[PDB]
Structures are given as structure tokens and as C-alpha cells.
Amino acid sequence: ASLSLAPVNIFKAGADEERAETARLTSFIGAIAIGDLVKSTLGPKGMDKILLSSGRDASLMVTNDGATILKNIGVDNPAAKVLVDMSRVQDDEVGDGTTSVTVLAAELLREAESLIAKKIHPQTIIAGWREATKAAREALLSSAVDHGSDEVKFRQDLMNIAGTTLSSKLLTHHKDHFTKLAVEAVLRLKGSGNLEAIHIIKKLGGSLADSYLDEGFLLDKKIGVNQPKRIENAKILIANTGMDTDKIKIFGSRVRVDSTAKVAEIEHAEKEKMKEKVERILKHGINCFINRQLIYNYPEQLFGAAGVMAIEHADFAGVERLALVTGGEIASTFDHPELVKLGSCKLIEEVMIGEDKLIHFSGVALGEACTIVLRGATQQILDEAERSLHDALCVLAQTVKDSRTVYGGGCSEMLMAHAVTQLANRTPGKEAVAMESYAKALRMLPTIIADNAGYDSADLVAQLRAAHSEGNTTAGLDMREGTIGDMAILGITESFQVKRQVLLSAAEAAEVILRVDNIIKAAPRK
Amino acid sequence: ALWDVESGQLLQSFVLCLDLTGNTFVSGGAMVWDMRSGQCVQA
Amino acid sequence: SSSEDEDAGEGISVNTGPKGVINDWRRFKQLET
Ligand SMILES: Nc1ncnc2c1ncn2[C@@H]1O[C@H](COP(=O)(O)OP(=O)(O)O)[C@@H](O)[C@H]1O
Ligand SMILES: [Mg+2]
Numbered sequence: 001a002s003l004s005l006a007p008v009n010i011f012k013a014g015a016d017e018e019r020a021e022t023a024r025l026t027s028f029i030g031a032i033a034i035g036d037l038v039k040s041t042l043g044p045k046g047m048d049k050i051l052l053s054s055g056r057d058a059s060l061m062v063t064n065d066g067a068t069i070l071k072n073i074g075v076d077n078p079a080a081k082v083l084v085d086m087s088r089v090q091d092d093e094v095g096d097g098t099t100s101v102t103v104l105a106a107e108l109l110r111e112a113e114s115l116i117a118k119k120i121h122p123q124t125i126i127a128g129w130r131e132a133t134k135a136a137r138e139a140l141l142s143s144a145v146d147h148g149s150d151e152v153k154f155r156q157d158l159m160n161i162a163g164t165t166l167s168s169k170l171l172t173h174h175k176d177h178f179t180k181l182a183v184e185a186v187l188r189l190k191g192s193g194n195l196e197a198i199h200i201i202k203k204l205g206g207s208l209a210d211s212y213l214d215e216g217f218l219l220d221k222k223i224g225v226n227q228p229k230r231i232e233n234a235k236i237l238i239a240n241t242g243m244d245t246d247k248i249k250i251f252g253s254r255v256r257v258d259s260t261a262k263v264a265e266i267e268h269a270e271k272e273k274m275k276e277k278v279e280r281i282l283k284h285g286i287n288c289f290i291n292r293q294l295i296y297n298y299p300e301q302l303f304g305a306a307g308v309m310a311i312e313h314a315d316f317a318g319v320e321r322l323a324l325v326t327g328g329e330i331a332s333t334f335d336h337p338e339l340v341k342l343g344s345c346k347l348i349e350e351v352m353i354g355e356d357k358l359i360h361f362s363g364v365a366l367g368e369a370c371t372i373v374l375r376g377a378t379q380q381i382l383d384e385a386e387r388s389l390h391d392a393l394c395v396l397a398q399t400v401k402d403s404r405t406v407y408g409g410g411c412s413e414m415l416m417a418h419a420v421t422q423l424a425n426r427t428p429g430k431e432a433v434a435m436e437s438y439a440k441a442l443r444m445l446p447t448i449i450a451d452n453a454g455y456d457s458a459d460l461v462a463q464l465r466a467a468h469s470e471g472n473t474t475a476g477l478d479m480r481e482g483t484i485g486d487m488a489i490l491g492i493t494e495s496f497q498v499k500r501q502v503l504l505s506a507a508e509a510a511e512v513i514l515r516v517d518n519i520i521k522a523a524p525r526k
Numbered sequence: 527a528l529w530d531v532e533s534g535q536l537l538q539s540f541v542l543c544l545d546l547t548g549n550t551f552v553s554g555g556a557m558v559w560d561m562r563s564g565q566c567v568q569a
Numbered sequence: 570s571s572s573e574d575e576d577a578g579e580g581i582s583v584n585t586g587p588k589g590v591i592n593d594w595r596r597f598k599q600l601e602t
Pocket of ligand 1: 044046409410477479
């Protein structure tokens with residue numbers, strides 16, 4: 001007898017449970033709903049979605065990113081929660097692939113539902129899927145191509161990867177310009193994976209084509225009152241000192257005198273201490289001074305008297321980026337000027353972007369830190385462009401880390417599914433049926449890609465399957481006019497890491513959800 | 527958020543109640559933050 | 570001077586649950602009737 005369907009009641013008020021039919025049905029409906037929601041935003045012809053917040057602020061967000069869509073939705077279905085967390089983890093691990101992994105998991109779970117309807121034990125499906133995943137992973141690894149040795153071919157691969165990543169976003173309008181921008185920004189990192197070193201500034205107004213990658217650096221801070229507004233051949237000193245009534249850190253100390261003259265003497269001593277601090281700072285022979293914390297009126301007056309630029313309140317990210325771009329050292333003590341390296345740049349000036357004024361560093365020494373100015377017509381456009389640029393930069397950094405690349409446009413899915421089908425053709429039992437369903441989902445991915453463009457998806461997928469079975473391992477969807485073509489010639493390439501992560505995460509989450517045969521819910525707080 | 531009284535500027539933005547050396551403070555919804563590093567240090 | 574102006578699955582067809590809960594249903598139904 002079931003727990004809920006028994007004469008005696010064993011549950012608190014509001015707590016229930018769902019047995020075989022109900023649990024599997026709930027899981028499958030949740031997964032299919034999530035997959036159908038996230039899809040239609042997939043491929044070069046995917047469309048965007050509007051996310052209306054129900055809160056008091058009522059935030060507006062139009063986006064194409066699958067993870068962003070899945071994060072900002074009220075989800076109560078536990079399997080849907082599993083898929084949402086899968087997409088979030090995929091976004092954390094790599095840039096793109098958030099929609100692909102979700103759609104693949106949903107298709108796998110649809111095939112699992114169909115198989116369960118055919119009286120096949122879910123554990124058999126899991127074993128068949130494990131074997132299929134092994135075969136597909138081996139095929140994808142064998143199909144990978146590496147061009148990290150040759151610089152020109154690696155740069156071409158980076159351009160192709162950035163273009164493929166941006167083809168599905170709102171940036172596809174200026175894909176060429178934005179791809180060049182992203183590739184330059186990533187290459188300026190000098191091999192570092194620090195994506196925080198790339199700062200994206202969104203300024204309203206102007207055109208999307210007006211966006212650019214600054215040759216130097218841009219800071220959104222302000223200069224002091226009497227400080228110079230323009231420095232040539234600047235010598236930078238990046239600091240993280242107090243400089244705001246810098247109190248001696250003996251917090252048990254107090255001034256305990258018997259006259260106001262002594263109090264005046266002590267405050268003069270404090271001012272003299274601050275002046276000596278500024279003098280020690282100036283002993284380094286500097287023209288500009290960026291401090292992470294605030295700079296009060298007396299130190300900035302001293303700096304203006306010394307005629308050196310003093311930028312204040314540049315947060316931890318700001319000072320880190322300035323150190324990366326100018327080569328300086330973030331110093332908190334100034335007793336050994338010879339042991340502190342000073343940042344350098346050719347010119348510092350104030351630039352006028354939109355209606356706001358920003359500090360511009362030109363002719364930087366190192367340059368291993370980028371600032372990207374994004375211009376748009378709406379705040380929604382700026383946010384979506386920032387998200388798309390983040391995707392492109394993430395994928396480019398991953399490719400820099402691991403230079404192995406695979407061919408997109410459904411070619412990788414087609415070859416993996418062909419390997420899965422070949423394995424299934426020599427396997428007895430219902431495991432072969434499970435393998436065939438796995439290959440069916442792998443086919444269904446480029447099928448959805450073709451459907452989103454309005455092409456004849458069935459015929460195109462049949463042509464791709466025939467071409468891959470024949471031996472044309474580089475065949476893929478040509479989305480320019482709706483035919484099939486050589487992905488190597490067309491330059492539709494992807495990161496091997498992204499595709500492998502999509503495959504493995506989708507298979508893992510499908511296996512996790514398929515194992516559930518009972519969903520027990522506790523009584524909610526409300 | 528913590529603000530500088532004299533300069534009237536937002537030092538750093540990070541909570542039904544919170545309590546505090548004016549460098550380490552704990553916020554409850556524990557979440558201990560250090561102003562020297564601007565990161566959560568205890569939980 | 571000083572002197573101035575200042576001054577899916579919708580079809581459920583629930584099967585046995587109604588049988589299990591008919592006791593409470595009739596418990597409320599008698600008072601409601
Ligand atoms: N120019 C192109 N030609 C053919 N296929 C493409 C092209 N650009 C992207 N795709 C395909 O569209 C799919 C979806 O990519 P996208 O929606 O940008 O991100 P995600 O992989 O997170 O869905 C990818 O698997 C890729 O193979
Ligand atoms: Mg993408």
C-alpha cells in the first residue's frame with residue numbers, strides 16, 4: 001500500500017507525495033516545459049524573450065541567453081529546478097551552451113518518457129545512455145582539431161569561434177565589428193584567464209556600431225579640485241591607503257589633556273602627520289596618484305599644491321585593473337620608494353562620452369586590462385549587448401586555455417549521434433532502443449536549430465545524417481540560405497570544451513532525473 | 527550599505543539587522559564582512 | 570541694510586482520492602446542508 005493512499009494518514013497538513021505515474025509525469029512535464037521555453041532562442045535565427053519582473057521595481061529584461069531566462073523565472077517543479085541549476089552551472093563553467101544543454105536534457109527526457117511508455121525499465125535506459133554517452137564522447141574527442149601551434153590559424157579559429165558565438169545574439173547585426181572587438185579584448189589579456197580585467201561600460205545613446213574597445217583604459221572616477229586635468233608622460237602610483245583622517249590603529253588611545261592649547265597642538269601634529277605622509281608619497285616622483293579609498297580635503301589640497309593628479313575612490317577592481325594596465329604596484333606603505341614599481345602611460349586626460357566625463361589613460365605600458373564602451377538606444381539593448389559580449393569573451397578565454405575546436409552547425413551533434421547509432425546497431429536488448437533514443441535527441445538538436453529558421457528541418461537533418469553516414473564528417477547546416485555545407489570552409493567552429501560540457505552535463509542531468517520514482521514534498525512555510 | 531558621514535559618499539555596498547574597530551561587521555538575515563578586503567570572512 | 574524683507578495533464582480524472590476523503594467531505598457536507 002502507498003504512503004499517501006492508506007487508511008491511516010502519515011503526513012503533516014500540506015505534505016504530500018507522488019508515486020510512479022505521478023512522479024514521472026511531474027518530472028517529464030517540468031523538463032519538457034523548461035526545454036520548450038528555452039528553445040526557439042537557439043541557433044542563428046533564434047529570437048529573444050521579454051522578462052517582466054512582478055516586483056515593485058518591475059525590472060524589464062530582453063535576452064537571448066538561456067541561463068539568464070532560466071534564472072529569472074519562478075519555478076516550483078523540482079525537475080525544472082534541476083534543469084535550471086544545470087544551466088546555471090553550465091554558464092559558470094563555460095560561456096555559451098546554456099540553451100543547448102537544457103534543450104538536449106529536455107529531448108533526452110522526452111525520449112525517456114516515450115521509452116517508459118514502451119515498458120522499459122528506467123535502469124536499462126540509464127545503462128544504454130551511459131554507453132551512448134561514452135561512444136559520443138569518444139567520437140567528439142576524435143573529431144577535435146587543434147591549431148594552437150600556428151598563430152595565424154589560431155587567430156582565424158578565434159575569429160570564427162567569436163562569430164559563431166555572437167551569431168545568435170542581438171550583436172549579429174554588427175557581428176564582424178563585435179567579433180573583432182571581442183577577439184582583440186581577449187588577446188590583450190596576454191593569456192590570462194582573468195575576465196574581470198575586461199571592463200564593460202554601458203553608455204546610453206549612440207549606435208551599437210559606435211561601440212569600441214579603447215586602446216588604453218577608461219576610469220569613471222573624478223579628479224581633485226586643484227589637481228591638473230591633463231598629464232603627459234605620467235608616472236602612476238596606485239595605492240590602498242586611508243588618506244582620510246588616517247587614525248593611528250591603537251584604538252585604545254585618546255587625547256587627555258588639561259587645556260585647549262594642547263588640543264590645538266595635537267591637531268596640528270595630526271595635520272603634520274598627514275602632510276608627512278603626502279611628502280613620503282611624493283618622494284616617489286609621481287605625476288598621478290590613484291588611491292582605492294577616499295582622499296580628504298587636506299591631502300587633496302596638498303596634492304594640488306604639488307601639482308599631481310589624485311584620483312580617489314577607485315574600488316578594488318579599479319586599482320587591480322589600473323595595476324594590470326599600467327604595470328604599477330598597489331602600495332600601502334611609502335618608506336621604500338625604490339622597492340615600489342610605478343605605473344606608466346603616455347597621456348592622461350578627461351574624455352566626454354555621452355553626457356558623462358571619464359578619465360582616459362592613453363599609451364599604457366602593459367595594457368593587460370581592457371575597457372569596452374557599449375552604446376545603444378535602450379537600456380535593454382545595452383544589457384543584452386553586455387551579456388552577449390560576456391558570452392563571447394568567456395568562450396574566447398576558454399579557447400585560449402584549450403585550443404581544441406570542433407565544428408558547429410550541428411556537425412558535432414551529427415557525428416556523435418552517428419557514433420551512437422553505430423554502437424546501437426551492434427547491441428542486443430532494449431539498451432539498443434535507449435541508445436537510439438539518445439541519438440534521436442542528438443539529431444533533434446540541429447532539427448530545432450533548423451526549425452527556428454523556418455527551413456525544412458526534416459529534409460536537412462536527413463541530408464546531414466546521410467552525409468555523416470557516408471563519411472562527410474565536416475558536413476553541417478548552412479544557415480545563410482538553408483542548405484548543407486562544409487563547416488570547415490564556412491568557418492562555423494566551436495570550442496571543444498563547450499560542446500563536451502554540454503553533452504556530459506545534459507546526459508548527467510537526464511540520468512539524475514530519470515532515477516526518480518517518488519517525489520515527496522514537505523509542508524511549505526506559508 | 528556603509529556611508530562616510532563627513533564626505534557623504536558610499537564607501538562600499540554589500541539584511542534585517544546588522545552590527546559592528548569599524549572594519550569588521552556582522553549582518554544577519556551570520557555574514558561577517560571585512561572592510562580591508564571587502565569580502566565575507568565568516569558564516 | 571539689516572532692515573529688509575527679513576524685518577499539461579489538465580485532464581486528471583482523480584480515481585481513488587475522493588473515496589479516501591469522502592469521510593471529511595461528508596463531515597463538512599452535513600453541516601453545510
Ligand atoms: N553561423 C552559424 N551557422 C550554423 N550554426 C550556428 C551558427 N552560429 C551558431 N550556430 C549554432 O547555434 C547553436 C546555439 O548557439 P547559441 O544559441 O549562440 O548559444 P547556446 O549554445 O547557449 O544555445 C550552437 O550549437 C551552434 O552550433
Ligand atoms: Mg551562444
